[PDB]
């Protein structure tokens, strides 16, 4: 038997740290896979690295010519890739802060990026409606996918790196075979609101999608069926990341345009907590890989990142 954190009926996340230092809107925050670092990207063209447990500022990574919309870690936590309004991605060596490769090909802003699990590949999506697969070791573009007819808002590899899921303002989610670039599947709903975010579940079987109609949906990937819907927050404008939280119970976590962090019971769809303290739109949230820690970041009128932790929670107790 292994040590697995308790699964309460409702978590109890409390604010522990607030991290100030970006000078413009923060666009994304991500925990390193080894659990030691938190990376943030911002419209001020900077990446900042912070300690995951204490929020202590570690270093600033610079060189992009315009603002950054996304950042993503390699699997060994040694590299980062960023996507910038300057139409490039850059690969960084985290310990030294040096740009190893600039990936150019996109015709407009790069909005989203991710390493594949093996971390020899990078996928990216652009305002230019395309999805690109890049070679990390050489920095050349392997494929360009004619993915969508509007900006691409998110791209993500599944658990074994054989599939990429993409989303776009055109209202579509598509799944691509990495090896061939073939579109294997297009997800369409009764209606086609812009899709502002998508990602695979940790086991690769479901995809979680955000639409600009204040809705999160969990889709069965094989069947192309929507299995769960999550509402109650505000998301009509911004590309707000959403997360699977799995260290404590099984929750969906997302930011919101009403300045709060929302947490849903994955299975029942009920809101189980709303974290208050941010003072502007919560644009990005992320969940620590092993601890019950949530990082949240907010837009220009706030500009801070918050670390929340839940060690306890509500338990149901049968008296008899």
């Amino acid at each position: 038997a292994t040590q697995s954190k308790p699964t309460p009926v409702k978590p109890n996340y409390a604010l522990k740290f607030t991290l100030a230092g970006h000078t413009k809107a923060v666009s994304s925050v991500k925990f390193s896979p080894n659990g030691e670092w938190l990376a943030s990207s911002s419209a001020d063209k900077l990446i900042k690295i912070w300690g995951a447990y204490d929020g202590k500022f570690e270093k600033t990574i610079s060189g992009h010519k315009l603002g950054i919309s996304d950042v993503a870690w390699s699997s060994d936590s040694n590299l980062l890739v960023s996507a910038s309004d300057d139409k490039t991605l850059k690969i960084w060596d985290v310990s030294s802060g040096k740009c190893l490769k600039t990936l150019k090909g996109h015709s407009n802003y790069v909005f989203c990026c991710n390493f594949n699990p093996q971390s020899n590949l990078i996928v990216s999506g652009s305002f230019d409606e395309s999805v690109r697969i890049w070679d990390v070791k050489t920095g050349k573009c392997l494929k360009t996918l004619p993915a969508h007819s509007d900006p691409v808002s998110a791209v993500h590899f599944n658990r074994d790196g054989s599939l990429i899921v993409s989303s776009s303002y055109d209202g579509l989610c598509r799944i691509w075979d990495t090896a061939s670039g073939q579109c294997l599947k297009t997800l369409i709903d009764d209606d086609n609101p812009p899709v502002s975010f998508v990602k695979f579940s940790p086991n690769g079987k479901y995809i979680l999608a955000a639409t600009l109609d204040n809705t999160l949906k969990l889709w069965d990937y094989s069947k192309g069926k929507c299995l769960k819907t999550y509402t109650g927050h505000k998301n009509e404008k911004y590309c707000i990341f959403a997360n699977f939280s799995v260290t404590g119970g099984k929750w969906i976590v997302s930011g919101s345009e009403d300045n709060l962090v929302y947490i849903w019971n994955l299975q029942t769809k009920e809101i189980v907590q709303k974290l208050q303290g941010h003072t502007d739109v919560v644009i990005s949230t992320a969940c620590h890989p092993t601890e019950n820690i949530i990082a949240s970041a907010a837009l220009e009128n706030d500009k801070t990142i918050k670390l929340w932790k839940s060690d306890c929670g509500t338990l149901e107790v049968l008296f008899q």
Binding site: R159, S201, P202, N203, K205, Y206, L218, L227, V246, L266
Partner: peptide, 11 residues
């Protein structure tokens, strides 16, 4: 009803 979604299980 209410089949329990398992999003972490490796099958």
């Amino acid at each position: 009803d209410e089949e329990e979604i398992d999003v972490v299980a490796v099958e």
